Amino acid sequence: TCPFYKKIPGTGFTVDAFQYGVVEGCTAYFLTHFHSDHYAGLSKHFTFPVYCSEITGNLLKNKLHVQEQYIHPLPLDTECIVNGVKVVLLDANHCPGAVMILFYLPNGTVILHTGDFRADPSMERSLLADQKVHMLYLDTTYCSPEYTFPSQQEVIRFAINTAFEAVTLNPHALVVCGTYSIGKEKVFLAIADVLGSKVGMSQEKYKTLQCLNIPEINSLITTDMCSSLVHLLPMMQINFKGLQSHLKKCGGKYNQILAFRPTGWTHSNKFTRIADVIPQTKGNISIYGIPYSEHSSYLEMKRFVQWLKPQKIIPTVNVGTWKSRSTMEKYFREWKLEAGY
């Protein structure tokens, strides 16, 4: 059945609730972003109103073949009325098209649903600054103090510098980046830009990127793999077997692979700095795991919540175990005692 944390009280609305069939009483289904755990259930046969960003709407129409008459895209940072209720969509700093949703209930209650987000101080000067928020439905993915990671800027500097050094030393090296969903596009785009190359990819991935409103995208991506020295492959294929096989297919154009896997967090974060990261190597193949996150670190999450000062927090991630739920509740109490709300 649909969990309580996907239902918005006092309304006919659900959030990211497409895998439960017809949810009784639901008059409008919101979709925060185009990631599969959130869209699961949508297809060309869906016939209820879906509310989302413009980018998410492009992906629904073109990738899932949802009919246009049921897609309701909303502009960002703009007050809109949906089934008699005022809503605002805000940038979530997650993947392209990802939003947080503010709901203004008829009775005076104000609710923020973060979707998936990476909290940033720039959010402290959006439309959030303009009123009190009573209830917060929070992306708690990394809600534990062991989860530190660097800024996105520091991780990109590392990737650019590593790729540029490798290809300048060996002009016959190929760079490969893994992907399995939208998000983390800066990794492969920034490397291609430093090397003066387009990024080569499958037709399916090219289609996906053409839906994202990225400026000058025709200038950065291509389906002509032969003309490119940065290739995108499925994340599954970023291992020694899969990369050896890919190198065979390039027909002696290249003699080395430098590959990147842009994972969220991996335990080496606890004891290491970004400057100190090293690859796994076998023969003429090296693989770097880089901690590029599109979710809040523990400290970023803490700062956001202590700034917002909500009356009630409802976690949306790690809710399946009593130990996880107890742990998160202890942190929320700490944060409230420190800040004084």
Binding site for Ni ion (CB under 5 A): 35, 116
| Cβ neighbour number for residue 135 with a 10 Å cutoff | 19
Closest CA to 184 of 212, 218, 215, 222: 212
Q: How far is the CB of 318 from Ni ion (least distance, A)?
A: 14
Question: Closer CB to Ni ion, residue 116 or residue 185?
Answer: 116
Q: How far is the CB of 96 from Ni ion (least distance, A)?
A: 11
Three-state SS letters, 32-55: CCCCHHHHCCCCCCCCCCEEEEHH
The total number of residues written for the chain in this structure: 341
Q: How far is the CB of 122 from Ni ion (least distance, A)?
A: 19
Tokens 């239902």 label which residue?
7
Q: How far is the CB of 98 from Ni ion (least distance, A)?
A: 7
Q: How far is the CB of 298 from Ni ion (least distance, A)?
A: 18
User: What one-letter code names the amino acid at 332?
Assistant: F
Question: Closer CB to Ni ion, residue 96 or residue 150?
Answer: 96
Q: For 149-297, where are the alpha helices, taking DSSP H only?
A: 152-169, 185-195, 203-210, 240-249
Q: Distances from the Cα of 63 to the Cαs of 33, 56, 319, in angstroms?
A: 13, 10, 30
Q: How far is the CB of 261 from Ni ion (least distance, A)?
A: 17
Question: Closer CB to Ni ion, residue 35 or residue 184?
Answer: 35
Pairing of strands 285-289, 256-261: parallel
Cα torsion angle, 183, 188, 193, 194, sign: positive
Q: How far is the CB of 35 from Ni ion (least distance, A)?
A: 4
Question: Closer CB to Ni ion, residue 116 or residue 300?
Answer: 116
Q: Read out DSSP for 239-273?
A: SHHHHHHHHHHTTTS-SEEEEEE--S--GGGGT--
Could you give the CA distance from residue 58 to residue 73 in angstroms, rounded to a whole number?
9
Q: For the chain, where are the alpha helices, taking DSSP H only?
A: 36-39, 54-63, 152-169, 185-195, 203-210, 240-249, 298-308, 322-339
Question: Closer CB to Ni ion, residue 54 or residue 193?
Answer: 54
Question: Closer CB to Ni ion, residue 3 or residue 283?
Answer: 3
Question: Closer CB to Ni ion, residue 11 or residue 316?
Answer: 316
